[PDB]
């Protein structure tokens, strides 16, 4: 018997656990799954469960009549917390015959379970009630005759409260007459009380389901509100794709897409001018809107907008949405994104790397290059690690680069922005893979790790005397192409070291300012001493650190690329010039000390 009691108890626990861990569902669904799955191990002729309404507070418009005295104050049953006894749902499981199950939303007081006050009293006090010969007791006035058209009559009642962890009562599980003629004994009291305690702890899973659905809704609302704030408004698009002012067309775009191509190809700067093909490109004389026009031109220039028939308005909206996705931080703003994208275009076209990659690969590279630091907060991964920002809890390593990838893929996920809408699936996977590779390759630790592999590739490729063999050798293996991809992304992100001295001095000042604001924050809000690179007090030490930054990082990349392609030979040459300039600033400081 006692073994059978514990086998029932343990089976009840295990199958209720199985059905709460099958799927995170609501209280009604979880108790339906548990009770109906444990239907055999209850061993009752019938039982029902009624859940109480959880509204602890009334809305103010429902409390006004009470304070005004228009409606007399509610007197009578009240839960121990003070909620009204209002069963909002009953689920009746009829196990005596036909195995019927019914759900009664908002049961009336006429409902046979609520006809007797015993669930109401259990909600009033939270006592466990064992009631022998229920129609013979005068207090709760149970049904003396048949309850319903079937010849079923109440003989015992075992009513228990489900308790939330705040000691609020959540429902009343009314287990009616036992299958045997015996009353409910303390062994069945123990079994049912164990069941009700497990159900009251599975209320955690129900509360977590409800919290998680609210979190998911709040997240999707916040993302959609962000999407509206970020997406280019129609006037922002029309500021570039001037179809209205030239095609004489209303707000609805019914124009031919070829005519939109024709009208845009006249509105984009000429790529031979403004040095869009040159390493010496400087974005300082261009406004961000001119950089958007340039970036659309650069997408045209790889000859991909027409070859894959991607729409022009989608491309323009995508570019402007990328511009708006960059913050106004001192250096990692949209200017850095466009300088990286322009450097990518120049590496493809002038660097002659395009011979290693398809049309689609080049298109993926340029789109990934534009978005590589989208929504940068101005602080390196170190600050995210130290301040424990939500980014650092979300993305473990390469925190910002994973954020920039995730946000640019979210931008591509909207169909009004998706330049890859008109391409087949396997091509979508290819472009997404190249997007991920290119964006994640902008973490400098990854570059530092893979320097050796890239150098081994370049050393192997220098041994062949003819270009056709080199292209066959590289293009056969995907991985070698991915290493060239990663080192191209790193060589573009650091491209400012290669820019002429006039550009380099101002960009190095901007980087130093962003690092000083980083150090200010770590000192003010974290009580840590900044690193001298991030210490504003060592402003005068800035040129020497730049020499080390040239001597340690970039020189390897541009040596390997100048070996690998003679066309990238000028880029390293500019780096060398900039080092000499920083040397003229470092040793003067040793003359000032």
């Amino acid at each position: 018997y006692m073994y059978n009691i514990e086998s029932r108890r343990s089976q009840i626990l295990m199958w209720s656990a199985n059905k709460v861990f099958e799927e995170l569902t609501d209280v009604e669904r979880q108790f339906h799954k548990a009770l109906y799955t444990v239907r055999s191990y209850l061993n009752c002729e019938r039982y029902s469960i009624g859940l109480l309404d959880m509204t602890k507070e009334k809305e103010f418009y429902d409390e006004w009549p009470i304070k005004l005295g228009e409606v007399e104050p509610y007197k009578g049953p009240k839960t121990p917390d003070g909620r009204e006894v209002n069963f909002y749902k009953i689920i009746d499981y009829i196990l005596h015959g036909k195995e019927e199950i019914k759900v009664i939303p908002t049961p009336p007081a006429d409902h046979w379970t609520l006809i007797s006050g015993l669930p109401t009293y259990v909600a009033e006090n939270g006592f466990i009630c064992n009631m022998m010969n229920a129609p013979a007791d005068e207090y709760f006035t149970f049904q003396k005759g048949p309850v319903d058209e079937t010849g079923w009559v109440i003989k015992n009642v075992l009513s228990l409260p489900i308790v939330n962890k705040k000691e609020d009562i959540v429902g009343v599980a009314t287990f009616y007459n036992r299958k045997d003629g015996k009353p409910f004994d303390e062994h069945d009291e123990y079994i049912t009380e164990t069941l009700t305690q497990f159900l009251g702890w599975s209320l955690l899973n129900t509360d977590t389901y409800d919290k998680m659905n609210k979190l998911e809704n709040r997240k999707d609302i916040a993302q959609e509100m962000l999407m509206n704030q970020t997406k280019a408004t129609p006037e922002e698009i029309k500021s570039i794709l001037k179809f209205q002012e030239k095609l004489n067309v209303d707000v609805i775009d019914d124009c031919e897409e070829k005519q939109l191509v024709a009208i845009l190809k006249e509105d984009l700067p000429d790529p031979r001018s403004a040095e869009l093909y040159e390493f010496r490109f400087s974005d300082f004389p261009l406004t961000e809107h001119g950089l958007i026009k340039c970036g659309i031109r650069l997408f045209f220039e790889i000859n991909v907008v027409e070859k894959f028939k991607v729409p022009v308005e989608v491309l323009t909206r995508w570019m402007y949405t990328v511009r708006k996705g960059y913050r106004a931080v001192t250096y990692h703003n949209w200017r850095h994104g466009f300088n990286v994208g322009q450097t990518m275009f120049t590496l493809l076209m002038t660097g002659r790397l395009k011979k290693y990659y398809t049309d689609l690969e080049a298109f993926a590279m340029l789109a990934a290059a534009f978005c590589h630091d989208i929504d940068h907060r101005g602080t390196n991964n170190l600050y995210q690690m130290k301040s424990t920002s939500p980014l650092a809890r979300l993305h473990g390593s390469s925190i910002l680069e994973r954020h920039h990838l995730e946000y640019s893929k979210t931008l591509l996920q909207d169909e009004s922005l998706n330049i890859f809408q008109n391409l087949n699936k396997r091509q979508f996977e290819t472009v997404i893979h190249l997007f991920e590779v290119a964006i994640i390759a902008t973490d400098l630790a990854l570059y530092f790790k893979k320097r050796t592999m890239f150098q081994k590739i370049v050393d192997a490729c220098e041994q062949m005397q003819t270009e056709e063999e080199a292209i066959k050798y590289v293009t056969v293996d995907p991985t070698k192409k991915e290493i060239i991809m990663a080192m191209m992304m790193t060589a573009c992100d650091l491209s400012a070291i290669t820019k002429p001295w006039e550009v380099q001095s101002q960009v190095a000042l901007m980087v130093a300012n962003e690092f000083w604001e980083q150090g200010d924050l770590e000192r003010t809000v974290l009580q840590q001493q900044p690193i001298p690179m991030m210490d504003r007090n060592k402003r005068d030490e800035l040129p020497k650190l730049q020499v080390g930054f040239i001597d340690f990082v970039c020189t390897f990349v541009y040596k390997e690329f100048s070996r690998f392609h003679k066309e990238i030979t000028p880029m390293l040459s500019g780096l060398q010039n900039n080092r000499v300039e920083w040397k003229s600033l470092a040793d003067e400081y040793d003359a000032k000390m």
Partner: peptide, 24 residues
């Protein structure tokens, strides 16, 4: 009729230099 209360990697040179530039 009974009522009860409810029961309740990098090289060593990289490992040194990357700290100064905040690359770690």
């Amino acid at each position: 009729p009974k009522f009860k209360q409810r029961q309740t990697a990098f090289n060593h040179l990289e490992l040194h230099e990357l700290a100064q530039y905040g690359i770690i």
